[PDB]
Each structure stands twice: as C-alpha cells, then as structure tokens.
C-alpha cells in the first residue's frame, strides 16, 4: 500500500490518456517538489495538474497538506496550493473570497498565461477587475471539489480522529465498478462512493489482465485517475483548460 | 511471545513431517509393487509348464 | 498484597468480544512485541484491538 | 510499503549508474512481463538484469517466484529464471547440475550471444562441451547468491512459516549504513545484514536531501540497488558481462 502518489507512476500510467508533461518540466519537477515540500513544512505535496494557456506558458499546479481530520461528517484536508510556469520555482496560489468566487466562475475561455492580467465583469454599471490567479484558483477549487478520487477504504480514522492511510488495505475487490472508488472528503465507513454521483459523469476502463483501472471524469474532461491493483498504487492528474462540460446531457 | 514462536516452529515441523511420511509411504508401496512384479515374472515358466 | 486480588479480578472479567481482559491485554502486548509496529500507540486501535475494513 | 519492485522506478533511479535498457526493449518488457507472469502461474516476476554479449544481442534475464518459505534457517525462494534477446518472447533458463557448475565457473570472457554455441574444456584428455545457456545460468546463480539485496525487516514470517512482505514496515532508520540492508535469503529477525559481509565489498551513497540510497556491489561490479526512503520503494538490477572481480584487494 502506497503512502503518497508517485509522480513517475502517474505520468507513466496516464500517458495513454494524453496527460503528459514536457521533458524539461519533468526534470524540473523531480528537483523542485522536494525543495518546496520541505521549506513549506508539509507532509505531502504532489503535482495536481496542468492548465493550458493561450501564450504557451501552461500553469503547473501542485497541492500539499499536512494532516486530514474528520469535521462535521467530512474528511477535511487543510490543503495549500502552489503554481508555477516552468516547474522550478513555486509561488503561492492564495484562496479567493466567496463573493469573488461567483465572478471568477462567470469568466470562461482559456486562460491568458500572464499572471498579471485581470479580466473585467460588468454588473448593475459597476465593473469589477478579477485577477487571473483568482480565476485559476477557483477553477482548481471546482475541479478539486468535483473529483478528488481515492480508492474506497484506503483511508481510516485513528484515535485522535484523524484520517490516515489504512496500511492494511488489501485492494478493491471489483476494480471495474465505481463502488471501488470514492471522494477524498468522504469519511471512512460512510458508504458514500462514486456510484452515488450523478449517473453518467464517470467512465471506467479496466484492463483485467494487467490489473490497471482508469477512471475518467466526463463532467470535467481532463481529470484522469489510475489504480494499479497488482502493485496497489493509484493517483490522479488534471490536464486541460479547467472549464466544466455543461453539454453533458447531449453528449451521452 | 516465546511460546508462540516455539509453537509456530513446531507446527511447521509437523507439516514437513507429514510430507516426509507420504513420501515414505509411496517409496514403500513402489518397492512392494516391484517385488510382486519380479516374483510374478520369475514363476512364468513354472506356470506355463505345470499349471 | 492487592496485586493478586487485582490479577484475579482481571482474569475474572470477560471481554465484550472475548473473555479474561487480562488475557486480551496479554495477547495484545504479545502481538505488539512480536512486530514492533510503526506508531505502536496509534497502531493499538487500528491494527491489534480492531481490524481495518479491507484488511484481507 | 511496496509489494513488488517496479521496473519503471528501477530504471529511473538506477539510470545514473549506467544501468539502462534500450527503448524498444523497455516497451517490449512493459508488454511481455505480465504475459509470462500469468502464463507461468507466478505471483512475482521482475527484470533481474542484462548481460552483454559479443554480437550485440544482450541477454535480458527475468526472475520469478511464487512463495518463499523458511527452511533450515534460510529464507528459500523457489525461483525460476527466463531469458530473452529481444524483450518480447521469454524462454526458460533451466538449472544446471553441480558437476557442470564447476566447469562453467571455469569459463570466462564475454558471452557470445548465440544460444546454440557451446564452449570446450579439457581435463585429464577428456573434453567437455558446455552449452552457453549453462554458462549464463551459472553466472546468474553466482551473482544472485552474492547480492539479492532487500531492506532489513522488510519481510516477516507468518503463521504458516512463510516469508511475506511486512506491510507495517516503517523504513530504514539509518539509510546510509550497511546495517539497513540484508540478503534476501536471511531469515527475518536473524540479525544478519550486509555489514556481516566481507568488509569493503559494498559501497553506499546516500542523498540525504532527496532520501535515495544507492548500494553498489564492488565484488560483482554491475549490481546496483536503490532504496527511496520518502516513498518506501526499492529495487535492484544487474547490468554487465557477469564475471566476478577477483582483483578487489588490489583495487580498494
């Protein structure tokens, strides 16, 4: 049972799904992730995804946290996000207010690739200027609250009521069924899995000979998750512009 | 703890013993089979001549 | 002299999921000493006095 | 804690040590290892190494097994070996008698690369003809009984007295010391580690910032082992002609 997703295995298994990174960025990540993880005091830090931009400088986004705790029936991870445009130097991706969350939710299209740009919105005519990093952080928040996939019963609650890896996890009995996976923020033993999601928003392809399942999000096309059952590893990645697929009812 | 590890070693020895016992049984039965067959192949002229 | 009294008391009371609380603790300690686990204090509730849901 | 070494991580970590495989052979392995593992009924099968030949068709060697048991104070793995010269089709590497083991031990030089070749030896003048695959099997056996490195206390004994992965393994406390590693065939809890080997036959380089230790054999130059402590993975590989280094006393 893994303790943390491995970026090498993620990039190896999800390359068929087109979720790839540049070679220079791959090396740069191999160096930069440990540095930032140590100098931020975090226990976990991984590559969350890669958002494409109009000028060719895609945003790499990394997500880290220290400990996850059960609060109000949800497994809350106090996560912290960082962004980068070369894979070597990570900057903070600061949270956004709730009022601005709606405005950035109204902004669509592929991001510009210039962290200093700000878009404009008009309301009753009061104009707001929303920084691009705000739009980025909210798209990341939406995609994160939508997917955040882990296997079912891979976590467990400890005496201090904290969510820790279940080191005696044996694996998913039926890896080709959506019941084997769940959201990260669902408490262990709560029985809520991906099958409770809106029917038709997930696809699962399972290679029963090699034992590798791929779970693709259809609501957010670009989110891929993999689960290897013979080695008991798993991990996910987002690659794409970050916009939700609203025409899903017409495409199924 | 010491008792449990002793018990585990004992049980493994028991399993090995059963495998050895079955091997012995097979060897002995094959020996008896060969003996019977040789005795039979010896008394063939006395059979086709007398009886 | 209260030690023997307490020992009889503990070997007397039965576990909810067993018997002889004394012997339950003894098996727990023997299991912890058999393989000194990572974060033994935390592993007391997650691996020995219980069983994780997808263990086998 | 891993359950089986991952060839991708092995080739990634041991590439700096020159232990590399061709690109075509890498893809071919990615397909061929599962096929052979299934159709042989084995629980584990990994790439053991790669022996160079004089005609350019190096022998890839794979090693598999089903279960390891404690017999006579040794953790015996009933291993089975396969060879290949393209990475796609695996053939058997059959064991060799004890009498022939000495003769093939007397044969030196880089292998020919022609599985149908046989070398000649002369004794008191009785000439023996030793097939090349016999020499290959003997060299693999020697290298295997010499190194076979795993971390210390990564295995454990179960009720049936079998050697199984210790899924509660926490990691090596001091990864830069030879006490953290051991031979595979040493029983758990026996206290025999690599520090009991002949002093000077192992080298250890530990990158304390990334947490990756590399253990190189100096007696069999070409055997590399890696241990990553932040992700708790490890694995080894042999790359070279298979001959032992007998001049070691003059080279240290």
Coordinates of C-alpha atoms in Angstrom, one line a residue:
Chain A
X1 CA 0.0 0.0 0.0
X2 CA 1.5 3.3 -1.1
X3 CA 1.8 6.2 1.3
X4 CA 1.6 9.0 -1.3
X5 CA 1.1 9.1 -5.1
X6 CA 4.3 8.8 -7.1
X7 CA 4.6 11.3 -10.0
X8 CA 6.6 8.9 -12.1
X9 CA 4.0 6.2 -11.9
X10 CA 1.2 8.7 -12.5
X11 CA 2.9 10.1 -15.6
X12 CA 3.6 6.5 -16.8
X13 CA 0.1 5.2 -16.4
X14 CA -1.8 8.3 -17.5
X15 CA 0.3 9.0 -20.6
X16 CA -2.1 7.0 -22.8
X17 CA -4.8 9.4 -21.7
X18 CA -2.8 12.3 -23.1
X19 CA -2.0 13.5 -19.6
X20 CA 1.7 14.3 -20.2
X21 CA 4.2 17.0 -19.2
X22 CA 7.2 18.3 -21.0
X23 CA 10.6 16.7 -20.5
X24 CA 12.3 19.8 -19.1
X25 CA 9.3 20.3 -16.8
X26 CA 9.5 16.6 -15.7
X27 CA 13.2 17.0 -14.6
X28 CA 12.4 20.4 -13.0
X29 CA 9.6 18.8 -11.0
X30 CA 11.8 16.0 -9.9
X31 CA 14.1 18.6 -8.3
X32 CA 11.6 21.3 -7.2
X33 CA 8.8 19.3 -5.4
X34 CA 11.1 18.2 -2.5
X35 CA 12.5 21.6 -2.0
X36 CA 9.1 23.3 -1.7
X37 CA 7.7 20.4 0.3
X38 CA 10.5 20.8 2.9
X39 CA 10.6 24.6 3.0
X40 CA 6.8 24.8 3.5
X41 CA 6.7 22.2 6.3
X42 CA 4.3 20.0 4.5
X43 CA 4.0 16.2 4.9
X44 CA 2.5 15.7 1.4
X45 CA 3.0 17.7 -1.8
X46 CA 2.1 16.3 -5.3
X47 CA 1.5 17.5 -8.8
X48 CA -2.2 18.3 -9.1
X49 CA -2.4 19.2 -12.7
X50 CA -1.5 21.4 -15.7
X51 CA -3.8 24.1 -17.2
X52 CA -3.2 25.2 -20.8
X53 CA -2.9 28.9 -21.7
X54 CA -3.0 31.0 -24.8
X55 CA 0.6 32.0 -24.8
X56 CA 2.1 28.6 -24.3
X57 CA 3.2 29.0 -20.7
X58 CA 0.9 26.5 -19.0
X59 CA 0.3 26.7 -15.3
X60 CA 1.5 23.7 -13.3
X61 CA -0.4 23.4 -10.1
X62 CA 0.8 21.5 -7.0
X63 CA -1.3 20.6 -3.9
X64 CA 0.0 19.8 -0.5
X65 CA -1.2 19.3 3.0
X66 CA -0.1 18.2 6.5
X67 CA -2.9 16.3 8.1
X68 CA -6.6 15.5 7.4
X69 CA -9.2 15.5 10.1
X70 CA -12.8 14.5 10.4
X71 CA -15.1 17.5 10.9
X72 CA -18.9 17.6 10.6
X73 CA -19.0 14.3 8.8
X74 CA -16.4 15.3 6.2
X75 CA -12.8 14.4 5.9
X76 CA -11.3 17.9 5.7
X77 CA -7.8 18.2 4.2
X78 CA -6.2 21.6 5.0
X79 CA -4.7 21.9 1.6
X80 CA -2.4 24.5 0.2
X81 CA -1.8 25.2 -3.5
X82 CA 1.1 26.4 -5.4
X83 CA 1.6 27.3 -9.1
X84 CA 4.5 27.5 -11.5
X85 CA 5.1 28.3 -15.1
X86 CA 8.5 26.5 -15.5
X87 CA 8.5 23.7 -13.0
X88 CA 11.4 25.1 -11.0
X89 CA 10.0 28.0 -8.8
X90 CA 6.7 27.5 -7.0
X91 CA 4.6 30.5 -5.9
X92 CA 1.6 30.6 -3.7
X93 CA -1.9 30.3 -5.1
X94 CA -3.9 32.2 -2.5
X95 CA -7.5 31.5 -1.7
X96 CA -10.3 33.6 -3.0
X97 CA -13.3 35.2 -1.2
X98 CA -16.8 33.8 -1.7
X99 CA -18.1 37.0 -3.4
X100 CA -15.3 36.9 -5.9
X101 CA -15.8 33.1 -6.4
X102 CA -19.0 33.8 -8.3
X103 CA -17.4 36.4 -10.6
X104 CA -14.5 34.2 -11.5
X105 CA -17.0 31.4 -12.1
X106 CA -18.6 33.6 -14.7
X107 CA -15.3 34.0 -16.6
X108 CA -14.8 31.5 -19.3
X109 CA -12.3 30.7 -22.1
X110 CA -8.7 29.5 -22.0
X111 CA -6.5 31.4 -19.5
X112 CA -4.1 34.0 -20.9
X113 CA -0.9 32.8 -19.4
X114 CA 0.0 36.2 -17.9
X115 CA -0.3 36.2 -14.1
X116 CA -0.5 40.0 -14.0
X117 CA -3.6 40.1 -16.3
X118 CA -7.0 40.8 -14.9
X119 CA -10.4 40.3 -16.6
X120 CA -13.4 42.6 -16.4
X121 CA -17.0 41.9 -15.4
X122 CA -20.0 44.3 -15.5
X123 CA -23.0 44.4 -13.1
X124 CA -25.7 46.7 -12.0
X125 CA -22.7 49.7 -14.4
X126 CA -20.3 48.6 -11.7
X127 CA -17.2 47.0 -13.3
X128 CA -15.1 44.5 -11.4
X129 CA -11.5 43.6 -12.2
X130 CA -10.7 40.0 -11.3
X131 CA -7.0 38.9 -11.3
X132 CA -6.1 35.9 -13.4
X133 CA -4.7 34.0 -10.5
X134 CA -8.1 34.3 -8.8
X135 CA -9.7 32.6 -11.9
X136 CA -7.1 29.9 -11.7
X137 CA -7.5 29.2 -8.0
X138 CA -11.4 28.9 -8.4
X139 CA -11.1 26.6 -11.4
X140 CA -8.8 24.4 -9.3
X141 CA -11.2 24.6 -6.4
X142 CA -14.2 23.5 -8.6
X143 CA -12.3 20.6 -10.2
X144 CA -11.0 19.5 -6.8
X145 CA -14.4 19.5 -5.0
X146 CA -15.8 17.6 -8.0
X147 CA -13.2 14.8 -8.3
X148 CA -10.5 14.2 -5.6
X149 CA -10.7 10.4 -6.2
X150 CA -9.1 7.8 -3.9
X151 CA -9.9 4.1 -3.5
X152 CA -12.6 3.0 -1.1
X153 CA -11.4 2.1 2.4
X154 CA -7.9 3.1 1.6
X155 CA -8.0 5.6 4.5
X156 CA -9.0 5.1 8.1
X157 CA -9.7 7.0 11.2
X158 CA -7.3 6.9 14.1
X159 CA -7.6 7.6 17.8
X160 CA -7.1 11.3 17.5
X161 CA -10.0 11.2 14.9
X162 CA -7.7 11.9 12.0
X163 CA -7.8 10.4 8.5
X164 CA -4.6 8.4 8.0
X165 CA -3.6 5.8 5.4
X166 CA -5.0 2.3 6.0
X167 CA -1.8 0.4 5.9
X168 CA -3.7 -3.0 6.0
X169 CA -5.7 -2.1 2.8
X170 CA -5.9 -5.2 0.7
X171 CA -7.2 -3.6 -2.5
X172 CA -10.5 -3.1 -4.4
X173 CA -12.4 -6.4 -4.8
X174 CA -14.1 -5.3 -8.1
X175 CA -11.8 -2.7 -9.7
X176 CA -14.1 -2.2 -12.7
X177 CA -17.0 -0.9 -10.7
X178 CA -17.5 2.6 -9.5
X179 CA -18.1 1.3 -5.9
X180 CA -14.4 0.7 -5.5
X181 CA -13.6 4.4 -5.6
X182 CA -14.7 7.4 -3.6
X183 CA -14.1 11.1 -3.0
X184 CA -11.3 12.1 -0.7
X185 CA -13.6 14.2 1.6
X186 CA -15.9 11.2 2.4
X187 CA -15.4 9.8 5.8
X188 CA -14.1 6.2 6.1
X189 CA -17.0 3.8 6.6
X190 CA -19.6 6.3 5.4
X191 CA -20.6 4.1 2.4
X192 CA -20.6 7.1 0.0
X193 CA -18.7 6.2 -3.2
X194 CA -18.6 7.4 -6.8
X195 CA -21.7 5.4 -7.5
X196 CA -23.6 8.0 -5.5
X197 CA -22.5 10.6 -8.0
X198 CA -24.7 11.7 -10.9
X199 CA -25.1 8.6 -13.1
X200 CA -23.0 9.0 -16.2
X201 CA -20.4 11.5 -15.1
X202 CA -17.7 8.8 -14.7
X203 CA -16.2 6.3 -17.1
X204 CA -14.2 3.3 -16.0
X205 CA -11.9 1.2 -18.3
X206 CA -10.4 -1.9 -16.6
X207 CA -7.6 -4.0 -18.1
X208 CA -8.3 -7.2 -16.2
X209 CA -5.1 -8.9 -17.3
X210 CA -2.6 -6.3 -16.2
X211 CA -4.9 -5.0 -13.4
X212 CA -4.9 -1.3 -14.2
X213 CA -8.2 0.6 -14.0
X214 CA -8.6 4.1 -15.4
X215 CA -11.4 6.4 -14.2
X216 CA -12.1 9.4 -16.4
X217 CA -14.3 12.3 -15.4
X218 CA -16.8 13.2 -18.1
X219 CA -18.1 16.2 -16.2
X220 CA -14.6 17.7 -16.1
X221 CA -13.0 16.2 -19.2
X222 CA -9.3 16.1 -18.4
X223 CA -9.4 14.6 -15.0
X224 CA -7.8 11.1 -15.1
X225 CA -7.3 8.7 -12.2
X226 CA -5.5 5.4 -12.3
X227 CA -5.5 2.4 -10.0
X228 CA -3.0 -0.5 -10.3
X229 CA -4.2 -3.5 -8.4
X230 CA -1.3 -5.9 -8.6
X231 CA 1.1 -3.3 -7.1
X232 CA -1.6 -1.4 -5.1
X233 CA -0.8 2.1 -6.3
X234 CA -3.1 4.9 -7.5
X235 CA -3.1 8.5 -8.5
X236 CA -4.8 11.2 -10.5
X237 CA -4.0 14.2 -12.6
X238 CA -5.8 17.1 -14.3
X239 CA -4.7 18.3 -17.7
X240 CA -6.8 20.9 -19.6
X241 CA -8.1 24.5 -19.6
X242 CA -10.3 23.9 -16.4
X243 CA -13.8 24.5 -17.8
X244 CA -16.7 22.3 -16.9
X245 CA -18.6 20.4 -19.5
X246 CA -22.2 21.7 -19.3
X247 CA -23.4 19.9 -22.5
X248 CA -23.1 16.5 -20.9
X249 CA -26.7 15.6 -21.3
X250 CA -26.5 16.0 -25.0
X251 CA -23.2 14.1 -25.4
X252 CA -24.0 10.9 -23.5
Chain B
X1 CA 5.8 -14.4 22.8
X2 CA 8.5 -17.1 23.2
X3 CA 5.8 -19.8 23.5
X4 CA 4.1 -18.6 20.3
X5 CA 7.2 -18.7 18.2
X6 CA 8.0 -22.2 19.6
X7 CA 4.5 -23.3 18.7
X8 CA 4.9 -21.9 15.2
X9 CA 8.2 -23.8 14.6
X10 CA 6.6 -26.9 16.0
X11 CA 3.6 -26.7 13.5
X12 CA 5.9 -26.1 10.6
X13 CA 7.9 -29.2 11.6
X14 CA 4.7 -31.1 11.8
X15 CA 3.8 -30.2 8.2
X16 CA 7.2 -31.2 6.9
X17 CA 6.8 -34.4 8.8
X18 CA 3.6 -35.2 7.0
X19 CA 5.2 -34.6 3.6
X20 CA 8.0 -36.9 4.6
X21 CA 5.6 -39.5 5.8
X22 CA 3.7 -39.6 2.5
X23 CA 6.9 -39.8 0.5
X24 CA 7.9 -42.8 2.6
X25 CA 4.6 -44.4 2.0
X26 CA 5.0 -44.0 -1.7
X27 CA 8.5 -45.4 -1.7
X28 CA 7.5 -48.4 0.3
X29 CA 4.4 -49.1 -1.9
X30 CA 6.5 -48.9 -5.1
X31 CA 9.1 -51.2 -3.6
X32 CA 6.4 -53.8 -2.8
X33 CA 5.0 -53.4 -6.3
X34 CA 8.4 -54.1 -7.9
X35 CA 8.8 -57.1 -5.6
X36 CA 5.4 -58.5 -6.6
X37 CA 6.2 -58.0 -10.3
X38 CA 9.6 -59.7 -10.1
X39 CA 8.2 -62.7 -8.2
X40 CA 5.4 -63.0 -10.9
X41 CA 7.9 -62.6 -13.8
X42 CA 10.0 -65.4 -12.2
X43 CA 7.3 -68.0 -11.9
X44 CA 6.1 -67.7 -15.5
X45 CA 7.9 -70.9 -16.8
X46 CA 6.6 -72.9 -13.9
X47 CA 3.1 -71.6 -14.7
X48 CA 3.2 -72.3 -18.5
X49 CA 4.7 -75.7 -17.9
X50 CA 2.8 -77.1 -14.9
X51 CA -0.3 -75.2 -14.1
Chain C
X1 CA -0.9 -8.0 48.5
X2 CA -3.6 -6.2 46.4
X3 CA -1.7 -7.4 43.3
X4 CA -3.0 -10.9 43.4
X5 CA -6.5 -9.5 44.1
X6 CA -6.3 -7.3 41.0
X7 CA -4.9 -10.1 38.9
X8 CA -7.8 -12.4 39.9
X9 CA -10.2 -9.5 39.1
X10 CA -8.7 -9.0 35.6
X11 CA -8.5 -12.7 34.8
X12 CA -12.1 -12.8 36.0
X13 CA -13.9 -10.1 34.0
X14 CA -14.6 -11.2 30.4
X15 CA -14.1 -9.1 27.3
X16 CA -17.1 -7.9 25.3
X17 CA -15.6 -9.8 22.3
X18 CA -13.9 -12.5 24.3
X19 CA -13.0 -13.2 27.9
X20 CA -10.4 -12.6 30.6
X21 CA -9.5 -8.9 30.0
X22 CA -6.1 -9.9 31.4
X23 CA -5.6 -12.4 28.6
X24 CA -6.9 -10.0 26.0
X25 CA -4.3 -7.4 27.0
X26 CA -1.7 -10.1 27.2
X27 CA -2.4 -11.2 23.6
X28 CA -2.3 -7.5 22.5
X29 CA 1.1 -7.0 24.1
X30 CA 2.4 -10.2 22.7
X31 CA 1.3 -9.1 19.2
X32 CA 2.8 -5.6 19.6
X33 CA 6.1 -7.1 20.8
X34 CA 6.1 -9.7 18.0
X35 CA 6.5 -7.0 15.4
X36 CA 7.0 -3.5 17.0
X37 CA 4.8 -1.5 14.7
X38 CA 5.2 1.9 13.2
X39 CA 3.5 4.3 15.7
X40 CA 2.7 1.5 18.1
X41 CA 0.5 3.7 20.3
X42 CA -1.6 4.6 17.2
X43 CA -1.5 1.0 15.9
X44 CA -3.1 -0.2 19.1
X45 CA -6.5 0.9 17.9
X46 CA -6.1 0.5 14.1
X47 CA -4.3 -2.9 13.9
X48 CA -4.5 -5.1 17.0
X49 CA -7.5 -4.2 19.2
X50 CA -9.6 -4.0 15.9
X51 CA -9.4 -4.8 12.2
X52 CA -9.4 -2.4 9.3
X53 CA -12.4 -2.9 7.0
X54 CA -10.5 -4.0 3.9
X55 CA -7.7 -6.0 5.5
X56 CA -7.9 -9.2 3.6
Chain D
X1 CA 5.4 -0.1 1.5
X2 CA 5.7 -1.6 -2.0
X3 CA 4.7 -5.2 -2.6
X4 CA 7.0 -5.8 -5.6
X5 CA 9.7 -3.8 -7.3
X6 CA 8.5 -1.6 -10.1
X7 CA 10.6 -1.7 -13.3
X8 CA 9.8 1.9 -14.1
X9 CA 11.2 3.2 -10.8
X10 CA 14.2 0.9 -11.0
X11 CA 15.1 2.1 -14.5
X12 CA 14.5 5.7 -13.3
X13 CA 16.6 5.6 -10.2
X14 CA 19.5 3.4 -11.5
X15 CA 19.9 5.2 -14.8
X16 CA 22.6 7.4 -13.3
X17 CA 24.6 4.2 -12.5
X18 CA 24.5 3.4 -16.2
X19 CA 22.0 0.6 -15.7
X20 CA 19.8 1.3 -18.7
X21 CA 17.9 -0.7 -21.3
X22 CA 17.0 0.1 -24.9
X23 CA 13.8 2.0 -25.6
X24 CA 12.4 -0.8 -27.8
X25 CA 13.3 -3.3 -25.0
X26 CA 11.6 -1.1 -22.5
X27 CA 8.3 -1.1 -24.3
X28 CA 8.6 -4.8 -25.1
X29 CA 9.2 -5.6 -21.4
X30 CA 6.1 -3.5 -20.4
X31 CA 4.1 -5.8 -22.6
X32 CA 5.9 -9.2 -22.1
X33 CA 6.4 -9.4 -18.4
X34 CA 2.7 -9.7 -17.5
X35 CA 2.0 -12.2 -20.2
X36 CA 4.8 -14.5 -19.0
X37 CA 3.9 -14.0 -15.3
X38 CA 0.3 -15.1 -15.9
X39 CA 1.0 -18.0 -18.2
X40 CA 3.6 -19.3 -15.8
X41 CA 1.3 -19.1 -12.8
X42 CA 3.8 -17.0 -10.8
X43 CA 3.0 -14.4 -8.2
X44 CA 6.1 -12.3 -8.8
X45 CA 8.2 -11.8 -11.9
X46 CA 10.7 -9.0 -12.4
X47 CA 13.6 -8.0 -14.6
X48 CA 16.7 -9.3 -12.9
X49 CA 19.3 -8.0 -15.3
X50 CA 21.0 -7.7 -18.7
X51 CA 24.2 -9.5 -19.7
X52 CA 26.2 -8.0 -22.6
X53 CA 27.4 -10.2 -25.5
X54 CA 29.9 -10.0 -28.3
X55 CA 27.4 -9.9 -31.1
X56 CA 25.2 -7.1 -29.7
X57 CA 22.2 -9.3 -28.7
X58 CA 22.4 -8.9 -25.0
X59 CA 20.6 -11.4 -22.8
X60 CA 17.7 -10.0 -20.7
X61 CA 17.1 -12.2 -17.7
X62 CA 13.9 -12.2 -15.6
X63 CA 13.4 -13.9 -12.3
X64 CA 10.1 -15.0 -10.8
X65 CA 8.7 -17.0 -7.9
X66 CA 5.5 -17.9 -6.1
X67 CA 6.2 -18.1 -2.4
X68 CA 9.2 -18.0 -0.1
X69 CA 9.5 -20.4 2.9
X70 CA 11.8 -20.7 5.9
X71 CA 13.9 -23.9 5.7
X72 CA 16.9 -24.8 7.7
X73 CA 17.4 -21.2 8.9
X74 CA 17.3 -19.8 5.4
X75 CA 14.5 -17.9 3.6
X76 CA 14.4 -20.1 0.5
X77 CA 12.7 -18.6 -2.6
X78 CA 11.8 -21.2 -5.2
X79 CA 12.8 -19.0 -8.1
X80 CA 12.5 -19.6 -11.8
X81 CA 14.5 -17.8 -14.4
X82 CA 13.8 -16.8 -18.0
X83 CA 15.9 -15.3 -20.7
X84 CA 15.3 -13.3 -23.8
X85 CA 17.2 -11.5 -26.6
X86 CA 14.5 -9.0 -27.7
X87 CA 12.3 -8.4 -24.7
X88 CA 9.2 -9.9 -26.2
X89 CA 9.5 -13.7 -26.0
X90 CA 10.8 -15.3 -22.9
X91 CA 12.4 -18.8 -22.9
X92 CA 13.3 -21.0 -19.9
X93 CA 16.7 -20.8 -18.3
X94 CA 17.0 -24.3 -17.0
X95 CA 19.1 -25.2 -13.9
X96 CA 22.5 -26.8 -14.2
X97 CA 24.0 -29.8 -12.4
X98 CA 26.6 -29.4 -9.7
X99 CA 29.3 -31.1 -11.7
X100 CA 28.7 -28.8 -14.7
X101 CA 28.6 -25.8 -12.3
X102 CA 32.4 -26.1 -11.8
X103 CA 33.1 -26.3 -15.5
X104 CA 31.0 -23.3 -16.4
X105 CA 32.6 -21.5 -13.5
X106 CA 35.9 -22.0 -15.2
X107 CA 34.7 -20.4 -18.5
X108 CA 35.5 -16.6 -18.6
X109 CA 35.1 -13.8 -21.1
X110 CA 32.1 -12.0 -22.5
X111 CA 29.4 -14.4 -23.7
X112 CA 29.0 -14.9 -27.4
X113 CA 25.3 -14.0 -27.9
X114 CA 24.4 -17.3 -29.7
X115 CA 22.3 -19.6 -27.5
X116 CA 23.3 -22.6 -29.6
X117 CA 27.1 -22.1 -29.1
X118 CA 29.0 -24.4 -26.7
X119 CA 32.4 -23.9 -25.2
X120 CA 35.0 -26.6 -24.6
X121 CA 37.0 -27.5 -21.6
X122 CA 39.9 -30.0 -21.3
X123 CA 40.6 -32.3 -18.3
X124 CA 42.5 -35.5 -17.5
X125 CA 42.5 -35.6 -22.4
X126 CA 38.7 -35.7 -21.8
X127 CA 37.0 -32.7 -23.4
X128 CA 33.6 -31.4 -22.2
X129 CA 31.3 -29.3 -24.3
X130 CA 29.3 -26.8 -22.1
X131 CA 26.3 -25.1 -23.7
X132 CA 26.3 -21.3 -23.5
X133 CA 22.9 -21.2 -21.6
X134 CA 24.6 -23.3 -18.9
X135 CA 27.3 -20.6 -18.5
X136 CA 24.6 -17.9 -18.4
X137 CA 22.6 -19.8 -15.7
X138 CA 25.7 -20.3 -13.6
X139 CA 26.8 -16.6 -13.8
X140 CA 23.2 -15.6 -12.8
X141 CA 23.3 -18.1 -9.9
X142 CA 26.6 -16.7 -8.6
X143 CA 25.5 -13.1 -8.9
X144 CA 22.2 -14.0 -7.2
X145 CA 23.7 -15.8 -4.2
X146 CA 26.1 -13.0 -3.8
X147 CA 23.8 -10.0 -3.8
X148 CA 20.0 -10.4 -3.7
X149 CA 19.6 -7.3 -1.6
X150 CA 16.5 -6.2 0.3
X151 CA 16.0 -3.7 3.2
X152 CA 16.3 -5.1 6.7
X153 CA 13.0 -6.1 8.4
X154 CA 11.0 -5.5 5.2
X155 CA 10.0 -9.2 5.2
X156 CA 8.4 -11.1 8.1
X157 CA 7.3 -14.7 9.0
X158 CA 3.7 -15.6 9.0
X159 CA 1.7 -18.4 10.8
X160 CA 2.4 -21.0 8.1
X161 CA 6.2 -20.1 8.5
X162 CA 6.4 -18.4 5.1
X163 CA 8.3 -15.2 4.3
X164 CA 5.8 -12.4 3.4
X165 CA 6.1 -8.7 3.0
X166 CA 6.0 -6.8 6.2
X167 CA 3.2 -4.3 5.4
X168 CA 3.8 -2.3 8.6
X169 CA 7.5 -1.7 7.7
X170 CA 8.3 1.9 8.6
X171 CA 11.6 2.2 6.8
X172 CA 15.3 2.1 7.5
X173 CA 16.3 4.3 10.4
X174 CA 19.8 5.0 9.0
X175 CA 19.7 4.5 5.2
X176 CA 23.4 5.4 4.7
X177 CA 24.7 2.4 6.8
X178 CA 25.0 -1.1 5.6
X179 CA 23.0 -2.4 8.6
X180 CA 19.8 -1.2 6.9
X181 CA 20.1 -3.8 4.1
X182 CA 20.4 -7.6 4.1
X183 CA 20.4 -10.6 1.8
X184 CA 17.0 -11.9 0.7
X185 CA 17.8 -15.4 2.0
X186 CA 18.4 -14.3 5.5
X187 CA 15.5 -15.0 7.9
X188 CA 13.7 -12.1 9.4
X189 CA 15.0 -11.4 12.9
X190 CA 18.2 -13.2 12.4
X191 CA 20.3 -10.1 12.7
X192 CA 22.5 -10.9 9.7
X193 CA 22.8 -7.9 7.4
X194 CA 25.2 -6.6 4.7
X195 CA 27.6 -5.5 7.4
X196 CA 28.4 -9.1 8.1
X197 CA 29.7 -9.4 4.5
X198 CA 33.4 -9.1 3.7
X199 CA 34.3 -5.6 4.6
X200 CA 34.8 -3.5 1.5
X201 CA 32.7 -5.4 -1.0
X202 CA 29.8 -2.9 -0.8
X203 CA 29.6 0.9 -1.4
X204 CA 26.7 3.1 -0.2
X205 CA 26.0 6.6 -1.5
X206 CA 23.1 8.4 0.3
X207 CA 21.5 11.6 -0.9
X208 CA 20.1 12.7 2.5
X209 CA 18.0 15.5 1.0
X210 CA 16.0 13.5 -1.5
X211 CA 16.3 10.3 0.5
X212 CA 17.7 7.9 -2.1
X213 CA 20.4 5.5 -1.2
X214 CA 22.4 3.6 -3.8
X215 CA 24.2 0.4 -2.8
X216 CA 26.7 -0.8 -5.4
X217 CA 28.5 -4.2 -5.3
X218 CA 32.2 -4.0 -5.7
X219 CA 32.7 -7.7 -5.8
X220 CA 30.3 -8.0 -8.8
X221 CA 30.7 -4.6 -10.4
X222 CA 27.4 -4.0 -12.2
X223 CA 25.0 -4.9 -9.4
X224 CA 23.1 -1.8 -8.3
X225 CA 20.4 -1.5 -5.7
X226 CA 18.4 1.6 -4.8
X227 CA 16.2 2.5 -1.8
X228 CA 14.0 5.5 -1.8
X229 CA 13.0 6.4 1.8
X230 CA 10.4 9.1 1.4
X231 CA 8.3 6.8 -0.8
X232 CA 9.5 3.5 0.7
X233 CA 10.4 1.8 -2.6
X234 CA 13.5 -0.2 -3.5
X235 CA 14.9 -2.5 -6.2
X236 CA 18.0 -3.8 -7.8
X237 CA 19.4 -4.6 -11.3
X238 CA 22.4 -6.3 -12.7
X239 CA 24.0 -5.0 -16.0
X240 CA 27.2 -6.4 -17.2
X241 CA 29.0 -9.4 -18.5
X242 CA 28.6 -11.4 -15.3
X243 CA 32.2 -12.0 -14.3
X244 CA 33.4 -11.6 -10.7
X245 CA 36.0 -9.0 -9.7
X246 CA 38.9 -11.1 -8.3
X247 CA 41.4 -8.2 -8.1
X248 CA 39.4 -6.5 -5.4
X249 CA 42.2 -6.5 -2.8
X250 CA 44.4 -4.5 -5.2
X251 CA 41.7 -2.0 -6.2
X252 CA 40.5 -0.9 -2.8

